[PDB]
């Protein structure tokens, strides 16, 4: 084939995903702000934060969507935006053999309606989002830290949280108990600025401001 | 001891609030310097600054007379007021 | 070879040797200060200077793929020899 290295691209899936994207957009124009199909046939739906519950319920219950499995629930921390956190939902439809992406936005101080009602799988995913990033979710049953140690300060996955953290641990013999101290690395993490100053992909050349 | 050590004038280049001191300095400053050649009158100007006068007295003391919107005659009358006392 | 320091400690090929007043020496007591003896700075000198009747040469360190990347040395300056940067072997044009 003329493209033995380039990954083949499917247009039929692109058309089916695009048609469904318009379908969902017309169904709930109250929350669906923009929708796009990526080059590698993946659909993303951009909803308003208030539409977290209604949009998910429609995708879960509609006969023409039947997205009945929350694959994962994560957020991407982008400090340059007004709402730095960007909650992302990934759903899979077993009946129609397709996956969808539903993404919202949220600043530091704003609660999001927990999707525990629609997807009981979200319950533990919600705690991770709050623990790693700090996004609080209202109506969550048992919202608490899930991964970080007890009495942990801050939210690690935030881009403004240092990788090495603020506190290390040590067994102090004077108190005969493991204690916490300010971090002091034997060798500091050698940061590597390895971004070439030459443009990589002209396709994503952001127009000048 | 509070004998006069230095006088600092901070004036804006184009602000109308510092217009009066500009009128003073083009005319009367030279005559003042002939009167007190030893005195270090400082005219460190700037942009968008409230026209103020600093007078450094001995033993490290500094008064902060502010000549905001003062006219040229007003600026001069403030000056001789500050240096009226030799100490 | 290895030169001993005045304080009585072997000096590494990098020239490292602890000062007499340096406290960071108690580590070596009841142990041994690891130093290599085959000083690469010396051993490369014993290699004979190859003589080839060509303006330029190609050195790969021997072994083809097992050596260093192939470089070309310009043996034009008759004043001195041309040495491969990777391995250090010298070359010289015989009276050009």
């Amino acid at each position: 084939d003329t493209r033995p290295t380039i990954r083949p691209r499917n247009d039929v899936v692109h058309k089916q995903l695009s048609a469904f994207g318009q379908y969902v957009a017309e169904i709930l124009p109250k929350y669906v702000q923009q929708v796009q199909v990526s080059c590698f046939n993946e659909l993303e739906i951009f909803i308003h934060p208030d539409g977290v519950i209604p949009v998910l319920t429609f995708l879960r219950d509609h006969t023409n969507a039947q997205f009945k499995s929350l694959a994962d629930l994560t957020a991407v921390d982008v400090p340059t935006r007004q709402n730095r956190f960007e909650i992302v939902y990934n759903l899979l439809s077993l009946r129609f053999n397709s996956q969808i992406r539903v993404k919202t936005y949220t600043d530091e101080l704003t609660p999001i309606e927990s999707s525990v009602t629609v997807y009981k799988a979200a319950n533990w995913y919600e705690r991770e989002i709050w623990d790693m990033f700090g996004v609080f979710f209202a109506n969550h049953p048992d919202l608490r830290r899930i991964l970080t140690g007890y009495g942990f300060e801050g939210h690690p996955f935030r881009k403004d949280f240092p990788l090495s953290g603020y506190v290390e641990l040590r067994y102090d013999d004077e108190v005969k108990r493991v204690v916490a101290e300010p971090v002091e690395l034997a060798q500091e993490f050698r940061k590597f600025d390895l971004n070439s100053p030459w443009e990589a992909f002209p396709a994503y050349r952001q127009p000048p401001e | 001891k509070l004998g006069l050590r230095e006088i600092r004038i901070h004036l804006c280049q184009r602000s109308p609030g510092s217009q009066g001191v500009r009128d003073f300095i083009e005319k009367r400053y030279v005559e003042l310097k002939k009167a007190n050649p030893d005195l270090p009158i400082l005219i460190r100007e700037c942009s968008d600054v409230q026209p103020k006068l600093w007078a450094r007295y001995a033993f490290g003391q500094e008064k902060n007379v502010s000549l905001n919107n003062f006219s040229a005659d007003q600026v001069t009358r403030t000056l001789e007021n500050v240096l009226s006392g030799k100490a | 070879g290895v030169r001993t320091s005045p304080t009585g400690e072997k000096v590494t090929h990098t020239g490292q040797a602890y000062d007499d007043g340096d406290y960071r020496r108690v580590r070596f007591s009841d142990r041994q200060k690891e130093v290599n003896e085959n000083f690469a700075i010396d051993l490369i000198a014993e290699q004979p200077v190859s003589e080839v009747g060509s303006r330029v040469i190609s050195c790969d360190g021997g072994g083809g793929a097992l050596g260093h990347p192939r470089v070309y040395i310009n043996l034009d300056k008759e004043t001195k020899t041309g040495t491969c940067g990777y391995c250090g072997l010298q070359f010289r044009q015989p009276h050009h």
């Binding site: 340059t80 881009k159 403004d160 953290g165 500091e188 070439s196 100053p197 401001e209 | - | -």
Partner: protein
Amino acid sequence: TQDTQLIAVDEKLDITTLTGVPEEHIKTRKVRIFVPARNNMQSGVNNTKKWKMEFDTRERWENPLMGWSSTADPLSNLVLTFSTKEDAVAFAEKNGWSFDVEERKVPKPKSKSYGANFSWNKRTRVSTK
């Protein structure tokens, strides 16, 4: 355009008490907002298009052992990227960090003409090509 029990929250965002940063690393640190200059060794410009946030350097001693560059300041390798100065300068005091901002240096346009290389009168005529 959203009736969600809206209340007046005029006061500036002060999330500092929630980020968990200790007291020391929240005042005595002076962050810098700047557009990084191009690496003068190179000529590309694709690294001078995003505002960067960085923290002032601190002590960096040498280990009693083999001697790496130890440190005790966690906010040493933290570099943040912002697409606009206003977003960058807003992230500083929202997190409660004293900042100084350096304006972007735009290379001024320079008129270049090949014909000037061979000028009848002007001293810009070159002696080699």
